[PDB]
Write a protein that binds this ligand. Sequence first.
Ligand SMILES: CNc1ccccc1C(=O)N1CCC(Nc2nc(-c3cc4ccc(C#N)cc4[nH]3)nn2CCCCCCCC(=O)O)CC1
Ligand SMILES: CNc1ccccc1C(=O)N1CCC(Nc2nc(-c3cc4ccc(C#N)cc4[nH]3)nn2CCCCCCCC(=O)O)CC1
Ligand SMILES: [Cl-]
Lengths: 128, 132
Amino acid sequence: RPALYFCGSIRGGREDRTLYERIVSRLRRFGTVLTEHVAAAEGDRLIHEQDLEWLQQADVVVAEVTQPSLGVGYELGRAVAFNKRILCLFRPRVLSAMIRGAADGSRFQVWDYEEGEVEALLDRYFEA
Amino acid sequence: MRPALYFCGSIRGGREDRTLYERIVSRLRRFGTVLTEHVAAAEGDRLIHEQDLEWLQQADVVVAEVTQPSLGVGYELGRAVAFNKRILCLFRPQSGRVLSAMIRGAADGSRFQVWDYEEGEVEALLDRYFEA
Ligand SMILES: CNc1ccccc1C(=O)N1CCC(Nc2nc(-c3cc4ccc(C#N)cc4[nH]3)nn2CCCCCCCC(=O)O)CC1
Ligand SMILES: CNc1ccccc1C(=O)N1CCC(Nc2nc(-c3cc4ccc(C#N)cc4[nH]3)nn2CCCCCCCC(=O)O)CC1
Ligand SMILES: [Cl-]
């Protein structure tokens, strides 16, 4: 099965816990979600090494980029250098030009969305 | 041959402090060329990303102010690690914040370092790092 990596900001996880769970639940239909048991409220070297191992194992990286995060950005930077296929999900805040600009319409895509249509978008992405 | 220094910080940290980022850049100029000294941060996006990536590849050292969360700063740090760059992260714990485990965990005490500091001592720390 394809290996899927999900990540999001700690702030996005706090205010929108259900949103991250909805994304992960939908991703499970298209493969194994390596980060599905991550409980964001979490020495640091062990976390970094496990994160890198999952990033290297992933076939697709799905990042929720609505809130600023050094961790999400760092994971995206490592993922680009690991030549991974990336999908960023943004809820229109101004998305960083480093993320919007990394998009190439194929291997790195950034999709603007409204909370309610996240399942439909994920279906479209993985049925293509 | 002057060393090429790359500086980056969050847009929030640039707004809430302004003088802090300018103090850091001014001090870095003593030790080398600052590739990002003329960055406004009031910013098509692809051109910005490609210019950023060119500066990252040219750098000898990357200095990042990591006090406020930022997708851009994190992304630049991730690309910098993969480009095998020497990195120094500057974090202010007085802000009450806890630095991301992805950044604190990337530290190895040598090639990637994270230093906790108080606003007033930033010039002294930069002098120590660059061996003044
Ligand atoms: C102030 N910020 C931080 C402070 C402390 C720690 C991290 C951060 C930080 O920068 N973060 C938080 C973590 C986030 N990455 C992330 N978030 C999720 C994630 C959120 C989430 C929510 C719901 C569900 C479901 N169902 C699944 C979820 N999966 N996965 N990943 C990737 C794995 C990395 C973790 C390594 C694990 C090592 C270990 O198991 O010991 C990036 C931003
Ligand atoms: C919501 N956030 C964003 C929204 C929109 C755009 C970016 C962000 C974002 O994530 N950012 C902001 C930019 C930041 N990086 C950064 N900040 C500085 C920087 C701040 C600063 C302050 C004072 C002084 C002095 N003296 C010098 C300074 N140099 N350099 N860099 C690296 C160069 C990248 C520029 C590419 C240009 C492309 C082009 O010209 O074609 C990362 C976080
Ligand atoms: Cl976060």
